[PDB]
Structure 1
Protein backbone atom coordinates (compact mmCIF):
# COMPACT_ATOMS: atom_id res chain seq x y z
CA UNK A 1 0.00 0.00 0.00
CA UNK A 2 2.23 2.68 -1.43
CA UNK A 3 2.90 6.19 -0.20
CA UNK A 4 1.10 9.48 -0.79
CA UNK A 5 2.69 11.22 -3.79
CA UNK A 6 4.00 14.78 -3.44
CA UNK A 7 6.25 17.17 -5.30
CA UNK A 8 9.41 15.93 -3.57
CA UNK A 9 8.59 12.45 -4.83
CA UNK A 10 7.99 13.68 -8.38
CA UNK A 11 11.09 15.87 -8.19
CA UNK A 12 13.15 12.87 -7.09
CA UNK A 13 11.74 10.85 -9.98
CA UNK A 14 12.91 13.52 -12.40
CA UNK A 15 16.44 13.27 -10.96
CA UNK A 16 16.46 9.49 -11.30
CA UNK A 17 15.14 9.74 -14.88
CA UNK A 18 17.73 12.38 -15.80
CA UNK A 19 20.36 9.88 -14.67
CA UNK A 20 18.87 7.22 -16.87
CA UNK A 21 18.95 9.69 -19.79
CA UNK A 22 22.67 10.53 -19.22
CA UNK A 23 23.44 6.80 -19.04
CA UNK A 24 21.62 6.06 -22.31
CA UNK A 25 23.21 9.01 -24.16
CA UNK A 26 26.63 7.31 -24.08
CA UNK A 27 27.75 6.97 -27.69
CA UNK A 28 29.34 3.62 -26.90
CA UNK A 29 25.78 2.38 -26.42
CA UNK A 30 25.02 3.09 -30.08
CA UNK A 31 21.40 2.88 -28.93
CA UNK A 32 19.05 2.41 -31.92
CA UNK A 33 16.18 4.86 -32.45
CA UNK A 34 13.46 2.20 -32.90
CA UNK A 35 10.42 1.69 -30.64
CA UNK A 36 10.64 1.31 -27.81
CA UNK A 37 13.21 4.13 -27.46
CA UNK A 38 14.00 5.17 -23.95
CA UNK A 39 15.46 8.56 -24.92
CA UNK A 40 12.01 9.62 -26.26
CA UNK A 41 9.96 7.73 -23.62
CA UNK A 42 11.49 9.49 -20.62
CA UNK A 43 10.89 13.08 -21.70
CA UNK A 44 7.40 12.19 -23.02
CA UNK A 45 6.65 10.84 -19.53
CA UNK A 46 8.02 13.95 -17.99
CA UNK A 47 5.79 16.05 -20.31
CA UNK A 48 2.64 14.10 -19.35
CA UNK A 49 3.33 14.25 -15.60
CA UNK A 50 3.84 18.03 -15.86
CA UNK A 51 0.46 18.07 -17.61
CA UNK A 52 -1.02 16.12 -14.64
CA UNK A 53 0.51 18.41 -11.99
CA UNK A 54 -0.80 21.45 -13.84
CA UNK A 55 -4.36 20.06 -13.76
CA UNK A 56 -4.09 19.45 -9.98
CA UNK A 57 -2.46 22.76 -9.00
CA UNK A 58 -5.24 23.62 -6.57
CA UNK A 59 -5.69 20.07 -5.41
CA UNK A 60 -2.47 18.19 -4.77
CA UNK A 61 -3.85 16.21 -1.84
CA UNK A 62 -6.53 14.74 -4.09
CA UNK A 63 -3.91 13.68 -6.64
CA UNK A 64 -1.27 12.38 -4.24
CA UNK A 65 -3.89 10.21 -2.50
CA UNK A 66 -5.13 8.61 -5.75
CA UNK A 67 -4.28 4.92 -5.53
CA UNK A 68 -3.52 4.35 -9.20
CA UNK A 69 -1.16 7.33 -9.16
CA UNK A 70 0.58 6.19 -5.94
CA UNK A 71 1.07 2.72 -7.43
CA UNK A 72 2.29 4.26 -10.69
CA UNK A 73 4.82 6.69 -9.14
CA UNK A 74 6.21 3.94 -6.88
CA UNK A 75 6.70 1.77 -9.96
CA UNK A 76 8.30 4.55 -12.01
CA UNK A 77 10.91 5.10 -9.26
CA UNK A 78 11.47 1.37 -8.91
CA UNK A 79 11.91 0.81 -12.66
CA UNK A 80 14.22 3.86 -12.91
CA UNK A 81 16.44 2.60 -10.05
CA UNK A 82 16.54 -0.80 -11.79
CA UNK A 83 17.83 0.66 -15.03
CA UNK A 84 20.52 2.67 -13.14
CA UNK A 85 21.53 -0.44 -11.18
CA UNK A 86 21.65 -2.32 -14.44
CA UNK A 87 24.24 0.03 -15.99
CA UNK A 88 26.29 -0.12 -12.81
CA UNK A 89 26.44 -3.95 -12.66
CA UNK A 90 26.59 -4.65 -16.40
CA UNK A 91 29.41 -2.23 -17.08
CA UNK A 92 31.30 -3.10 -20.23
CA UNK A 93 28.65 -5.61 -21.19
CA UNK A 94 26.39 -2.58 -21.76
CA UNK A 95 28.40 -2.00 -24.94
CA UNK A 96 27.94 -5.51 -26.28
CA UNK A 97 24.91 -5.23 -28.54
CA UNK A 98 23.41 -8.57 -27.51
CA UNK A 99 24.76 -9.37 -24.07
CA UNK A 100 22.30 -10.26 -21.32
CA UNK A 101 22.54 -6.83 -19.71
CA UNK A 102 21.70 -5.14 -23.01
CA UNK A 103 18.71 -7.44 -23.65
CA UNK A 104 17.58 -6.42 -20.20
CA UNK A 105 17.74 -2.71 -21.17
CA UNK A 106 15.40 -3.53 -24.08
CA UNK A 107 13.01 -5.15 -21.60
CA UNK A 108 13.05 -2.11 -19.34
CA UNK A 109 12.49 0.20 -22.35
CA UNK A 110 9.41 -1.82 -23.21
CA UNK A 111 8.14 -1.38 -19.62
CA UNK A 112 8.70 2.39 -19.87
CA UNK A 113 6.66 2.36 -23.10
CA UNK A 114 3.79 0.39 -21.45
CA UNK A 115 3.89 2.67 -18.45
CA UNK A 116 3.50 5.84 -20.50
CA UNK A 117 0.69 4.38 -22.62
CA UNK A 118 -1.16 3.38 -19.41
CA UNK A 119 -0.65 6.77 -17.83
CA UNK A 120 -2.10 8.51 -20.88
CA UNK A 121 -5.03 6.05 -20.95
CA UNK A 122 -5.81 6.72 -17.24
CA UNK A 123 -5.08 10.49 -17.26
CA UNK A 124 -6.04 11.67 -20.75
CA UNK A 125 -5.03 15.34 -20.90
CA UNK A 126 -3.70 15.01 -17.35
CA UNK A 127 -7.10 14.46 -15.73
CA UNK A 128 -7.92 11.25 -13.83
CA UNK A 129 -10.54 9.17 -15.60
CA UNK A 130 -9.65 5.64 -14.50
CA UNK A 131 -13.08 5.34 -12.93
CA UNK A 132 -14.76 5.91 -16.29
CA UNK A 133 -12.30 4.00 -18.51
CA UNK A 134 -13.99 2.35 -21.45
CA UNK A 135 -13.39 -1.40 -21.73
CA UNK A 136 -13.60 -2.29 -25.40
CA UNK A 137 -15.06 -5.81 -25.41
CA UNK A 138 -18.59 -5.89 -23.91
CA UNK A 139 -18.24 -9.28 -22.13
CA UNK A 140 -14.88 -8.21 -20.63
CA UNK A 141 -16.37 -4.88 -19.48
CA UNK A 142 -19.28 -6.71 -17.67
CA UNK A 143 -16.80 -9.00 -15.91
CA UNK A 144 -14.71 -6.10 -14.62
CA UNK A 145 -17.72 -3.98 -13.64
CA UNK A 146 -19.27 -6.82 -11.60
CA UNK A 147 -16.12 -7.99 -9.89
CA UNK A 148 -14.42 -4.63 -9.33
CA UNK A 149 -17.03 -1.91 -9.95
CA UNK A 150 -15.18 1.29 -10.89
CA UNK A 151 -11.74 0.39 -9.59
CA UNK A 152 -8.86 1.53 -11.81
CA UNK A 153 -6.44 -1.00 -10.34
CA UNK A 154 -6.44 -4.30 -8.42
CA UNK A 155 -3.67 -6.44 -6.85
CA UNK A 156 -2.82 -9.53 -8.93
CA UNK A 157 -4.04 -11.99 -6.34
CA UNK A 158 -7.56 -10.55 -6.25
CA UNK A 159 -7.58 -10.33 -10.07
CA UNK A 160 -6.48 -13.94 -10.47
CA UNK A 161 -9.13 -15.20 -7.96
CA UNK A 162 -11.84 -13.21 -9.67
CA UNK A 163 -10.80 -14.41 -13.10
CA UNK A 164 -10.54 -18.04 -11.99
CA UNK A 165 -14.25 -18.23 -10.95
CA UNK A 166 -15.24 -17.54 -14.56
CA UNK A 167 -12.26 -18.88 -16.62
CA UNK A 168 -10.60 -21.57 -14.48
CA UNK A 169 -6.79 -21.34 -14.31
CA UNK A 170 -5.37 -24.89 -14.35
CA UNK A 171 -2.10 -24.61 -12.30
CA UNK A 172 0.13 -22.09 -10.58
CA UNK A 173 2.53 -22.27 -13.58
CA UNK A 174 -0.30 -21.26 -15.93
CA UNK A 175 -1.17 -18.43 -13.59
CA UNK A 176 2.39 -16.98 -13.53
CA UNK A 177 2.57 -17.17 -17.32
CA UNK A 178 -0.80 -15.31 -17.50
CA UNK A 179 0.43 -12.66 -15.05
CA UNK A 180 3.45 -11.97 -17.22
CA UNK A 181 1.30 -11.49 -20.34
CA UNK A 182 -1.30 -9.21 -18.74
CA UNK A 183 0.86 -7.35 -16.22
CA UNK A 184 2.61 -5.24 -18.86
CA UNK A 185 3.87 -2.72 -16.31
CA UNK A 186 5.37 -5.46 -14.10
CA UNK A 187 4.03 -3.97 -10.88
CA UNK A 188 1.97 -6.89 -9.44
CA UNK A 189 -1.29 -5.06 -10.14
CA UNK A 190 -3.75 -5.35 -13.04
CA UNK A 191 -4.97 -1.95 -14.25
CA UNK A 192 -8.28 -1.65 -16.09
CA UNK A 193 -6.14 -0.44 -19.06
CA UNK A 194 -4.01 -3.64 -18.95
CA UNK A 195 -7.18 -5.75 -18.71
CA UNK A 196 -8.63 -4.00 -21.84
CA UNK A 197 -5.49 -4.76 -23.91
CA UNK A 198 -5.37 -8.47 -23.01
CA UNK A 199 -9.13 -9.07 -23.61
CA UNK A 200 -8.92 -7.25 -26.93
CA UNK A 201 -5.94 -9.39 -28.06
CA UNK A 202 -7.39 -12.77 -26.84
CA UNK A 203 -11.06 -12.33 -27.66
CA UNK A 204 -13.59 -13.73 -27.79
CA UNK A 205 -14.32 -13.63 -24.06
CA UNK A 206 -16.05 -16.98 -23.98
CA UNK A 207 -12.86 -19.01 -24.68
CA UNK A 208 -10.44 -16.33 -23.43
CA UNK A 209 -7.77 -18.54 -21.85
CA UNK A 210 -7.98 -21.12 -24.62
CA UNK A 211 -7.30 -18.38 -27.22
CA UNK A 212 -4.38 -17.23 -25.11
CA UNK A 213 -2.87 -20.72 -24.88
CA UNK A 214 -3.13 -21.42 -28.59
CA UNK A 215 -2.06 -18.02 -29.97
CA UNK A 216 0.56 -16.98 -27.47
CA UNK A 217 1.86 -19.99 -25.51
CA UNK A 218 2.18 -22.73 -28.02
CA UNK A 219 2.04 -21.06 -31.49
CA UNK A 220 5.22 -21.01 -33.57
CA UNK A 221 3.86 -17.92 -35.37
CA UNK A 222 3.89 -15.73 -32.27
CA UNK A 223 6.63 -13.10 -31.97
CA UNK A 224 5.53 -11.07 -28.99
CA UNK A 225 6.67 -7.43 -29.26
CA UNK A 226 8.39 -6.56 -32.58
CA UNK A 227 8.71 -3.53 -34.89
CA UNK A 228 7.47 -3.70 -38.47
CA UNK A 229 11.15 -3.50 -39.63
CA UNK A 230 11.96 -6.53 -37.45
CA UNK A 231 9.06 -8.52 -38.96
CA UNK A 232 10.30 -7.83 -42.53
CA UNK A 233 13.89 -8.93 -41.80
CA UNK A 234 12.64 -12.15 -40.20
CA UNK A 235 10.34 -13.12 -43.05
CA UNK A 236 12.89 -12.01 -45.69
CA UNK A 237 14.84 -15.24 -45.08
CA UNK A 238 11.68 -16.92 -46.36
CA UNK A 239 11.09 -14.55 -49.32
CA UNK A 240 11.31 -17.73 -51.40
CA UNK A 241 8.44 -19.62 -49.66
CA UNK A 242 5.10 -17.88 -50.28
CA UNK A 243 2.65 -18.30 -47.41
CA UNK A 244 5.23 -17.89 -44.62
CA UNK A 245 3.86 -15.66 -41.85
CA UNK A 246 4.31 -14.43 -38.29
CA UNK A 247 2.18 -12.19 -36.01
CA UNK A 248 3.35 -9.63 -33.50
CA UNK A 249 2.38 -7.13 -30.86
CA UNK A 250 3.27 -3.48 -31.31
CA UNK A 251 4.48 -1.30 -28.48
CA UNK A 252 3.09 1.81 -30.19
CA UNK A 253 -0.31 0.12 -30.83
CA UNK A 254 -1.26 -1.73 -27.63
CA UNK A 255 -4.12 -4.18 -27.91
CA UNK A 256 -3.85 -4.86 -31.64
CA UNK A 257 -2.15 -7.65 -33.70
CA UNK A 258 -0.18 -7.33 -36.97
CA UNK A 259 0.28 -10.23 -39.34
CA UNK A 260 3.34 -10.23 -41.64
CA UNK A 261 3.41 -12.60 -44.59
CA UNK A 262 5.24 -13.52 -47.83
CA UNK A 263 3.10 -13.09 -50.98
CA UNK A 264 3.28 -15.15 -54.19
CA UNK A 265 5.24 -12.37 -55.91
CA UNK A 266 7.99 -12.48 -53.29
CA UNK A 267 6.93 -9.41 -51.35
CA UNK A 268 6.19 -9.00 -47.66
CA UNK A 269 2.87 -7.47 -46.63
CA UNK A 270 1.30 -6.59 -43.29
CA UNK A 271 -2.32 -6.74 -42.22
CA UNK A 272 -4.06 -5.57 -39.03
CA UNK A 273 -7.14 -7.59 -38.13
CA UNK A 274 -9.62 -4.81 -37.11
CA UNK A 275 -12.49 -6.99 -38.02
CA UNK A 276 -12.26 -10.46 -36.50
CA UNK A 277 -10.44 -12.09 -33.61
CA UNK A 278 -6.85 -13.09 -34.64
CA UNK A 279 -7.97 -16.70 -34.13
CA UNK A 280 -10.43 -16.31 -37.04
CA UNK A 281 -8.13 -14.24 -39.24
CA UNK A 282 -5.58 -17.11 -38.93
CA UNK A 283 -8.18 -19.75 -39.84
CA UNK A 284 -9.46 -17.67 -42.77
CA UNK A 285 -5.96 -16.81 -44.04
CA UNK A 286 -4.89 -20.47 -43.99
CA UNK A 287 -7.95 -21.48 -46.01
CA UNK A 288 -7.45 -18.56 -48.39
CA UNK A 289 -3.89 -19.78 -48.88
CA UNK A 290 -1.99 -16.77 -47.49
CA UNK A 291 -1.05 -17.92 -43.98
CA UNK A 292 0.46 -21.40 -44.48
CA UNK A 293 3.84 -21.59 -42.79
CA UNK A 294 4.32 -20.03 -39.40
CA UNK A 295 7.85 -18.70 -38.96
CA UNK A 296 8.43 -20.53 -42.27
CA UNK A 297 7.69 -23.97 -40.68
CA UNK A 298 5.79 -26.60 -42.61
CA UNK A 299 3.24 -27.56 -39.99
CA UNK A 300 0.57 -24.99 -39.07
CA UNK A 301 -1.43 -25.38 -35.84
CA UNK A 302 -5.07 -26.41 -36.28
CA UNK A 303 -7.18 -23.67 -34.70
CA UNK A 304 -10.68 -24.90 -35.70
Structure 2
Protein backbone atom coordinates (compact mmCIF):
# COMPACT_ATOMS: atom_id res chain seq x y z
CA UNK A 1 0.00 0.00 0.00
CA UNK A 2 0.75 3.65 -0.53
CA UNK A 3 -0.85 3.97 2.93
CA UNK A 4 1.70 1.50 4.38
CA UNK A 5 4.50 3.57 2.90
CA UNK A 6 2.96 6.85 4.19
CA UNK A 7 2.71 5.36 7.68
CA UNK A 8 6.40 4.32 7.51
CA UNK A 9 7.39 7.82 6.46
CA UNK A 10 5.40 9.35 9.33
CA UNK A 11 6.97 7.08 11.91
CA UNK A 12 10.45 8.03 10.56
CA UNK A 13 9.64 11.74 10.68
CA UNK A 14 8.53 11.51 14.31
CA UNK A 15 11.67 9.59 15.20
CA UNK A 16 13.79 12.34 13.63
CA UNK A 17 11.90 14.92 15.65
CA UNK A 18 12.10 12.94 18.83
CA UNK A 19 15.89 12.77 18.41
CA UNK A 20 16.13 16.47 17.59
CA UNK A 21 14.14 17.32 20.75
CA UNK A 22 16.81 15.78 22.97
CA UNK A 23 18.01 18.81 25.04
CA UNK A 24 8.28 19.06 30.15
CA UNK A 25 4.88 19.96 31.65
CA UNK A 26 1.91 18.99 29.42
CA UNK A 27 1.65 19.30 26.54
CA UNK A 28 5.17 18.13 25.83
CA UNK A 29 6.67 17.21 22.44
CA UNK A 30 9.19 14.98 24.15
CA UNK A 31 6.29 12.89 25.44
CA UNK A 32 3.94 13.13 22.50
CA UNK A 33 6.31 12.34 19.63
CA UNK A 34 7.09 8.75 20.62
CA UNK A 35 3.54 8.17 21.78
CA UNK A 36 2.20 9.14 18.34
CA UNK A 37 4.83 7.08 16.57
CA UNK A 38 3.95 4.03 18.66
CA UNK A 39 0.26 4.49 17.81
CA UNK A 40 1.02 4.76 14.06
CA UNK A 41 2.97 1.51 14.17
CA UNK A 42 -0.18 -0.06 15.66
CA UNK A 43 -2.37 1.38 12.95
CA UNK A 44 0.10 0.06 10.29
CA UNK A 45 -0.11 -3.47 11.70
CA UNK A 46 -3.91 -3.34 11.92
CA UNK A 47 -4.38 -2.16 8.32
CA UNK A 48 -2.62 -5.36 7.08
CA UNK A 49 -5.75 -7.45 7.99
CA UNK A 50 -8.97 -8.00 5.98
CA UNK A 51 -11.76 -5.64 7.04
CA UNK A 52 -11.85 -3.70 10.28
CA UNK A 53 -11.44 -0.72 7.95
CA UNK A 54 -15.07 0.18 8.48
CA UNK A 55 -17.57 1.67 6.02
CA UNK A 56 -15.68 2.71 2.94
CA UNK A 57 -15.43 5.82 0.84
CA UNK A 58 -15.11 9.51 1.64
CA UNK A 59 -14.63 10.19 5.28
CA UNK A 60 -13.75 6.65 6.23
CA UNK A 61 -10.60 5.28 7.81
CA UNK A 62 -8.44 5.46 4.72
CA UNK A 63 -9.53 9.03 3.92
CA UNK A 64 -8.92 10.03 7.57
CA UNK A 65 -5.42 8.64 7.50
CA UNK A 66 -4.51 10.25 4.12
CA UNK A 67 -5.47 13.67 5.52
CA UNK A 68 -4.06 13.05 8.99
CA UNK A 69 -0.63 11.91 7.77
CA UNK A 70 -0.31 14.82 5.30
CA UNK A 71 -1.10 17.25 8.16
CA UNK A 72 1.24 15.43 10.57
CA UNK A 73 4.02 15.89 7.96
CA UNK A 74 3.38 19.62 7.64
CA UNK A 75 3.33 20.07 11.42
CA UNK A 76 6.47 17.97 11.81
CA UNK A 77 8.24 20.23 9.28
CA UNK A 78 7.27 23.28 11.23
CA UNK A 79 8.76 21.84 14.42
CA UNK A 80 11.98 20.79 12.63
CA UNK A 81 12.46 24.24 11.08
CA UNK A 82 12.24 25.74 14.58
CA UNK A 83 14.55 23.43 16.55
CA UNK A 84 18.19 24.34 17.16
CA UNK A 85 20.90 21.79 16.10
CA UNK A 86 10.36 34.44 23.47
CA UNK A 87 8.91 33.73 20.02
CA UNK A 88 10.47 30.24 19.85
CA UNK A 89 8.90 29.18 23.16
CA UNK A 90 5.47 30.34 21.96
CA UNK A 91 5.78 28.68 18.54
CA UNK A 92 6.78 25.40 20.13
CA UNK A 93 3.98 25.69 22.80
CA UNK A 94 1.35 26.11 20.06
CA UNK A 95 2.79 23.19 18.16
CA UNK A 96 2.87 21.04 21.31
CA UNK A 97 -0.85 21.78 21.76
CA UNK A 98 -1.44 20.79 18.09
CA UNK A 99 0.54 17.56 18.58
CA UNK A 100 -1.43 16.83 21.79
CA UNK A 101 -4.59 17.23 19.74
CA UNK A 102 -3.33 15.03 16.87
CA UNK A 103 -2.37 12.30 19.34
CA UNK A 104 -5.69 12.49 21.14
CA UNK A 105 -7.60 12.32 17.87
CA UNK A 106 -5.70 9.28 16.62
CA UNK A 107 -6.16 7.58 20.05
CA UNK A 108 -9.89 8.36 19.98
CA UNK A 109 -10.47 6.98 16.48
CA UNK A 110 -7.84 4.19 16.24
CA UNK A 111 -7.31 3.02 19.83
CA UNK A 112 -4.72 0.26 19.86
CA UNK A 113 -4.47 0.77 16.08
CA UNK A 114 -8.04 -0.35 15.41
CA UNK A 115 -10.45 1.98 13.64
CA UNK A 116 -13.67 2.87 15.44
CA UNK A 117 -14.66 6.06 13.63
CA UNK A 118 -17.90 4.50 12.32
CA UNK A 119 -18.93 3.56 15.87
CA UNK A 120 -17.58 6.57 17.82
CA UNK A 121 -20.17 8.26 20.02
CA UNK A 122 -20.26 11.92 20.90
CA UNK A 123 -20.58 12.98 24.55
CA UNK A 124 -23.64 15.19 24.04
CA UNK A 125 -26.62 13.30 22.62
CA UNK A 126 -28.08 16.11 20.50
CA UNK A 127 -24.69 16.54 18.84
CA UNK A 128 -24.27 12.81 18.38
CA UNK A 129 -27.61 12.64 16.49
CA UNK A 130 -26.66 15.61 14.35
CA UNK A 131 -23.39 13.99 13.30
CA UNK A 132 -24.79 10.55 12.47
CA UNK A 133 -27.83 12.01 10.70
CA UNK A 134 -25.75 14.50 8.69
CA UNK A 135 -22.49 12.65 8.15
CA UNK A 136 -23.51 9.01 8.48
CA UNK A 137 -20.77 6.56 9.17
CA UNK A 138 -18.00 9.06 8.23
CA UNK A 139 -15.48 10.17 10.82
CA UNK A 140 -14.08 13.18 8.98
CA UNK A 141 -15.16 15.97 6.62
CA UNK A 142 -13.35 18.84 4.91
CA UNK A 143 -14.18 22.20 6.55
CA UNK A 144 -16.26 23.51 3.67
CA UNK A 145 -18.57 20.48 3.63
CA UNK A 146 -18.80 20.55 7.40
CA UNK A 147 -19.74 24.29 7.44
CA UNK A 148 -22.51 23.54 4.95
CA UNK A 149 -23.88 20.51 6.87
CA UNK A 150 -23.65 22.31 10.22
CA UNK A 151 -25.63 25.13 8.63
CA UNK A 152 -28.72 22.97 8.23
CA UNK A 153 -29.15 23.57 12.00
CA UNK A 154 -26.59 26.22 13.08
CA UNK A 155 -25.64 28.55 10.24
CA UNK A 156 -22.65 30.87 10.65
CA UNK A 157 -22.04 34.13 8.81
CA UNK A 158 -19.47 33.73 5.97
CA UNK A 159 -16.16 35.51 6.31
CA UNK A 160 -14.44 36.43 9.55
CA UNK A 161 -17.08 34.79 11.80
CA UNK A 162 -17.03 31.49 9.90
CA UNK A 163 -13.22 31.55 9.85
CA UNK A 164 -13.11 32.14 13.61
CA UNK A 165 -15.46 29.16 14.01
CA UNK A 166 -13.18 27.04 11.87
CA UNK A 167 -10.17 28.11 13.97
CA UNK A 168 -12.01 27.07 17.16
CA UNK A 169 -13.25 23.68 15.89
CA UNK A 170 -10.09 22.57 14.06
CA UNK A 171 -7.97 21.27 16.94
CA UNK A 172 -5.41 19.70 14.68
CA UNK A 173 -5.27 22.71 12.22
CA UNK A 174 -5.75 20.19 9.41
CA UNK A 175 -8.55 21.91 7.57
CA UNK A 176 -10.84 18.93 8.27
CA UNK A 177 -13.28 18.33 11.05
CA UNK A 178 -13.26 14.86 12.63
CA UNK A 179 -16.02 13.43 14.70
CA UNK A 180 -13.62 13.74 17.67
CA UNK A 181 -13.15 17.47 17.09
CA UNK A 182 -16.88 17.95 16.82
CA UNK A 183 -17.31 16.04 20.14
CA UNK A 184 -14.86 18.40 21.82
CA UNK A 185 -16.46 21.52 20.38
CA UNK A 186 -20.02 20.56 21.28
CA UNK A 187 -18.92 19.75 24.89
CA UNK A 188 -17.16 23.11 25.29
CA UNK A 189 -20.02 25.14 23.79
CA UNK A 190 -23.08 23.25 25.09
CA UNK A 191 -26.01 23.42 25.11
CA UNK A 192 -26.80 22.30 21.55
CA UNK A 193 -29.89 24.35 20.78
CA UNK A 194 -27.97 27.62 21.06
CA UNK A 195 -24.55 26.22 20.07
CA UNK A 196 -23.25 29.05 17.95
CA UNK A 197 -24.73 31.81 20.13
CA UNK A 198 -22.88 30.22 23.01
CA UNK A 199 -19.70 30.17 20.96
CA UNK A 200 -20.17 33.81 19.87
CA UNK A 201 -20.85 34.94 23.48
CA UNK A 202 -17.82 33.00 24.86
CA UNK A 203 -15.19 32.69 22.13
CA UNK A 204 -15.70 35.76 19.98
CA UNK A 205 -17.10 38.46 22.26
CA UNK A 206 -15.78 37.60 25.72
CA UNK A 207 -12.52 39.22 26.89
CA UNK A 208 -11.82 36.28 29.24
CA UNK A 209 -11.44 33.68 26.47
CA UNK A 210 -7.98 32.49 25.37
CA UNK A 211 -7.33 30.00 22.60
CA UNK A 212 -4.36 27.65 22.23
CA UNK A 213 -2.74 28.48 25.55
CA UNK A 214 -1.06 25.98 27.81
CA UNK A 215 -1.43 25.76 31.59
CA UNK A 216 2.00 27.44 32.08
CA UNK A 217 1.11 30.22 29.64
CA UNK A 218 -2.04 31.12 31.64
CA UNK A 219 -0.09 30.96 34.95
CA UNK A 220 2.28 33.52 33.45
CA UNK A 221 -0.30 35.71 31.75
CA UNK A 222 -2.48 36.26 34.78
CA UNK A 223 0.47 37.33 36.96
CA UNK A 224 -0.09 40.76 35.23
CA UNK A 225 -3.36 40.85 37.20
CA UNK A 226 -2.17 39.38 40.55
CA UNK A 227 -2.96 42.64 42.38
CA UNK A 228 -6.56 42.46 41.06
CA UNK A 229 -8.35 39.56 42.87
CA UNK A 230 -11.36 38.47 40.79
CA UNK A 231 -9.44 38.62 37.50
CA UNK A 232 -9.93 35.46 35.39
CA UNK A 233 -9.49 33.88 31.98
CA UNK A 234 -10.84 30.65 30.52
CA UNK A 235 -9.36 28.31 27.94
CA UNK A 236 -9.77 24.74 26.82
CA UNK A 237 -8.02 22.15 28.96
CA UNK A 238 -5.17 20.44 27.08
CA UNK A 239 -5.27 17.25 29.10
CA UNK A 240 -9.04 16.88 29.54
CA UNK A 241 -10.23 17.69 26.04
CA UNK A 242 -13.79 18.96 25.92
CA UNK A 243 -13.47 20.63 29.31
CA UNK A 244 -12.68 24.18 30.34
CA UNK A 245 -9.84 25.36 32.55
CA UNK A 246 -10.63 28.63 34.36
CA UNK A 247 -7.60 30.55 35.67
CA UNK A 248 -8.34 33.16 38.30
CA UNK A 249 -6.66 35.48 40.87
CA UNK A 250 -7.80 34.65 44.37
CA UNK A 251 -8.29 37.17 47.29
CA UNK A 252 -4.60 36.78 48.27
CA UNK A 253 -3.24 37.27 44.71
CA UNK A 254 -2.48 33.60 43.96
CA UNK A 255 -3.16 32.40 40.41
CA UNK A 256 -5.17 29.13 40.50
CA UNK A 257 -6.75 27.01 37.77
CA UNK A 258 -9.90 24.94 38.07
CA UNK A 259 -11.91 22.61 35.75
CA UNK A 260 -15.71 23.24 36.04
CA UNK A 261 -18.57 20.75 36.30
CA UNK A 262 -20.20 19.42 33.10
CA UNK A 263 -22.38 22.54 32.97
CA UNK A 264 -22.68 25.15 30.27
CA UNK A 265 -19.77 27.53 30.77
CA UNK A 266 -22.19 30.48 30.74
CA UNK A 267 -23.77 29.12 33.91
CA UNK A 268 -20.44 28.46 35.62
CA UNK A 269 -19.37 32.04 34.88
CA UNK A 270 -22.74 33.58 35.95
CA UNK A 271 -22.60 31.74 39.29
CA UNK A 272 -18.97 32.62 39.86
CA UNK A 273 -19.74 36.29 39.17
CA UNK A 274 -22.52 36.12 41.78
CA UNK A 275 -20.20 34.46 44.26
CA UNK A 276 -17.51 37.11 43.66
CA UNK A 277 -14.76 35.01 41.98
CA UNK A 278 -14.92 35.63 38.22
CA UNK A 279 -15.28 39.34 38.01
CA UNK A 280 -12.68 40.95 35.77
CA UNK A 281 -12.17 39.06 32.51
CA UNK A 282 -8.45 39.10 31.60
CA UNK A 283 -8.23 41.75 34.36
CA UNK A 284 -10.47 44.19 32.31
CA UNK A 285 -13.15 46.38 33.90
CA UNK A 286 -16.12 45.13 31.92
CA UNK A 287 -17.56 41.66 32.49
CA UNK A 288 -19.97 40.94 29.61
CA UNK A 289 -23.63 40.08 30.35
CA UNK A 290 -24.20 36.36 29.80
CA UNK A 291 -28.01 36.57 30.21
Q: State whether structure 2 residue 14 is matched by structure 1 residue 23.
A: no
Contact 1:180 1:186 in 2 (8 A): yes
Task: State the alpha-carbon separation in 1 of the partners of residues 69 and 230 from structure 2.
Answer: 46
Matched residue, 1:58 = 49
Whole-angstrom distance in 2 between the partners of 1:224 and 1:173: 16
Matched, 1:196 2:170: no
State the shift of 1:78 in Å: 2.8
Determine which structure has greater relative contact order: mean sequence separation of CA pairs < 8 Å that are 6+ residues apart, divided by chain length.
2
For residues 52 and 290 of structure 2, the distance between their equivalents in structure 1, rounded to whole angstroms, comes to 52
Aligned partners of 1:38 and 1:109 also within 8 Å: yes
> What is the Cα deviation at residue 62 of structure 1?
4.7
**Cα distance between partner residues in 2 of 1:299 and 1:236:** 19
Q: Deviations over 1:1-37 (max 9, x none)?
A: xx9411x222222222233233333x4xxxxx23222
Residue 10 of structure 2 is aligned to residue 13 of structure 1: yes
| Whole-angstrom distance in 2 between the partners of 1:9 and 1:77 | 10
Q: Name structure 2 gaps, 5 residues minimum.
A: 55-59
List runs of 5+ in structure 1 lacking aligned partners. Answer: 28-32
Q: 1:4 to 1:144 in 2, by over 3 A?
A: farther
- Residue 298 of structure 1 aligns to a residue in which SS? coil
2:51 & 2:66 partners in 1: Cα distance?
A: 12
Q: Indicate whether 1:289 and 2:291 are aligned.
A: no
1:132 aligns with 2:129: no
Aligned match of 1:224 = 211
**Corresponding residue SS for 2:49:** helix
Give the 5 Å matches for 1:107-118: 107-118=94-105
- Helix, strand or coil at the partner of 2:194: helix
Question: Alpha carbons of 1:104 and 1:261: their partners in 2 closer, same or farther (altered >3 Å)?
Answer: closer
Question: Match of 2:263, SS?
Answer: coil
**Deviation digits for residues 28-86 of structure 1 (CA, Å, limit 9, x no counterpart):** xxxxx2322212111001111223234444349959972222222222223223433x3
- 1:210-234 deviation per Cα after TM superposition (whole angstroms, max 9, x unaligned): 1111211121111223333433333
Q: Which residue of 2 aligns with 1:247?
A: 234
TM-score (normalised: structure 2): 0.88
* In structure 1, C-alpha distance between the alignment counterparts of 2:75 and 2:275, rounded to whole Å: 45
CA distance in 2, matches of 1:233, 1:143: 39
> What is the alpha-carbon distance in structure 2 between the residues aligned to residue 240 and residue 146 of structure 1?
51
Alpha-carbon shift at residue 288 of structure 1 (Å): 1.5
TM-score, scaled relative to structure 1: 0.85
Q: CA shift at 1:102, angstroms? A: 5.3
1:45 equivalent in structure 2: 36
1:78 paired residue among 52, 70, 74 = 74
Partner-residue secondary structure (3-state), 2:246: strand
Which secondary structure state, in structure 1, belongs to the residue aligned with residue 290 of structure 2?
coil
Deviation string 1:119-176 (CA, Å, 9 cap, x unpaired) is 0000122211111111111111111111111211111111101112211212222111
**Per-residue deviation at 1:246?**
1.3
RMSD: 2.5
Aligned residues: 286
CA deviation vs aligned residue, 1:264-295 (integer Å, no higher than 9, x gap): 34444332222311111111111121111111
Mapped contact 1:250–1:256 kept (Cα < 8 A): yes
Residue pair 1:4, 1:70 contacting (<8 A) in 2 also: no
